[PDB]
Amino acid sequence: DLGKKLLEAARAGQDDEVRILMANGADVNAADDVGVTPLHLAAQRGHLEIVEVLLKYGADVNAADLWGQTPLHLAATAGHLEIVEVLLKNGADVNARDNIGHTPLHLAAWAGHLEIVEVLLKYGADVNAQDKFGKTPFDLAIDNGNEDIAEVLQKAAGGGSGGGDVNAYDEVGWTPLHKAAWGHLEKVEDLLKNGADVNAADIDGYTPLHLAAFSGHLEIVEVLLKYGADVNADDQAGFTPLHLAAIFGHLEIVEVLLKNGADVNAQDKFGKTPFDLAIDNGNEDIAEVLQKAA
Amino acid sequence: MVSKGEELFTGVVPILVELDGDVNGHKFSVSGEGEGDATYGKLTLKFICTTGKLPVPWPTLVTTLVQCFSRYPDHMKQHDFFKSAMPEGYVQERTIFFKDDGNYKTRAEVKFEGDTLVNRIELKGIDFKEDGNILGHKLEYNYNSHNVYIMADKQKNGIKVNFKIRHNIEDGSVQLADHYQQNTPIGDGPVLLPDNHYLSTQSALSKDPNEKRDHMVLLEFVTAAGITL
């Protein structure tokens, strides 16, 4: 219970107890059954003084738990700036990878800690490191609302999916248009002004028009059709956009799709027409329109 | 705006998972433990087949083995069904169709037991091929990123969820597992029925060199998206 007391002393932030346990020869590198060490616990929980004394006694700054996480990963995720600073000054690998491939810079960008992003960059963080799913720190900042961090990363030459080619696609086959289809009209418009291909299908077969129909954005549906979207795209998806609009009760979208040539006879993988799906989902107003469609 | 149940997830929450399984008559039990932090959408878990050798590939059980830990951004808090049903919890039911092979049917309850978030599942698998990819253990020990689609089910006071899992096969091909999911609250309090949106997932599977039993170490990050400010 000596390493267990120290692990517990580090977890609980017991500065004096850590101090005492270590004069008795407590293993500064004690690890629990998932590879968590006192330094992991202190860094994760924001215990600066404990971090400093563990490092004093030879705590391994780059110890990895079962999930590949080092103390720097945990401190960068939690926003503990001073701890991040002391781990780096004491030899932490600024580009260590968790089991997904995230570096500390990924995690700080994902979590919104701008000052931590800056200090990781100062210490040699790879601005364009990719996790195993292809994401850069810029991708994680920008897809999750951290515009201030995204700008810092771009000033440090960080890029991301679609930063050079509007028709690039990510791990799941999403282009910039697929991401923008979820209600970002101005972005959709800008991408189309700049040559984005409206007909791109993701890894499940979905086009941007499928996604806009699913999410109920009429004006995005309209602009994608204006730019030549296939109104009846299915292929591997298993549904056309009209099927989706019928399931979810999007009457104005149904009307636009019909005006643009949507096929009332298209069957999904269960044999259902849009009319059948409107009936099955309690959207009799859409069923009424569909059976009268021009 | 924000549900009362969301307050239970402001920090790290311990997790327990218990799964009772029967696939083509092969019975097994899996236990998991670890923690989740919805602040970051992060799970750190380890699972053990306590009965012996797991008779299906570990990847095929990942989705069955706690979507209340997804990170919902502030502008989407009113769309987080999963936390709104806490602490009383929700029932999560799925059918998982493995293309050109059998299916899993699962029923789980996800709820607080004291301060621990607990996922208790019963799984039945039928019609598997004896030397297919599942019973033949031909799936890579790996996992992909997915988009998880979430819709309200007003009649049931819950949600419907649909997605396709892609399992890499040892030869380079992909085994599709088509997921049909439904969640309903256990309790009687108000819950949040969301507008249509998605979750984006990342996972990594690994092994513990000090674990002698058949097991899976899982790191997972999930974030909600698709509704604009």
Residue numbers in the entry:
A (entry chain A): 13 to 306
B (entry chain B): 0 to 64, 68 to 231
What does the paper say about this structure?
DARPins are engineered proteins that consist of 4–5 structurally similar repeats that stack on top of each other, forming a compact protein domain. DARPins combine all potential advantages of single domain binders over antibodies: they are small in size (ca. 18 kDa), possess high biophysical stability, have very high expression yields in E. coli, can easily be genetically encoded for in vivo applications and are devoid of disulphides and hence well suited for applications where they are expressed in the reducing cytoplasm. Structural investigations showed that these DARPins bind to different but slightly overlapping epitopes.
To connect 3G124nc and either YKKD or YRLK we chose flexible GS-linkers. Therefore, two linkers of 7 and 11 aa named GS7 (GGGSGGG) and GS11 (GGGSGGGSGGG) were tested for linking 3G124nc with either YKKD or YRLK. The resulting four constructs were named gc_K7, gc_K11, gc_R7 and gc_R11 according to whether they contained YKKD or YRLK and the linker used was 7 or 11 aa long. The complexes crystallized under various conditions with different unit cells and one to four complexes per asymmetric unit (AU). All GFP-clamps form 1:1 complexes with eGFP, in which the clamp indeed wraps around approximately half the eGFP molecule and creates a continuous large interaction surface, similar to the superposition of the two parental DARPins on GFP (Fig. 4(a,b and c)). The buried surface area (BSA) of the GFP-clamp complexes is 1625 ± 72 Å2. Between 7 and 11 hydrogen bonds were found in the different structures. Hydrogen bonds of Trp79 from the GFP-clamp to Leu44 of eGFP, Trp79 to Leu220, Gln81 to Lys41, His114 to Gln204, Asp143 to Gln204, Asn156 to Arg73 and Phe226/230 (numbering for constructs with different linker lengths, respectively) to Asn198 seem to be the most crucial ones, since they are found in almost all complex structures. Whether the linker is visible or not largely depends on crystal contacts; e.g., the linker with the clearest electron density from the gc_K7:eGFP structure is stabilized by crystal contacts with a symmetry-related GFP-clamp molecule. All linkers that are fully or partially modelled exhibit elevated B-factors compared to the rest of the GFP-clamp if they are not stabilized by direct crystal contacts.
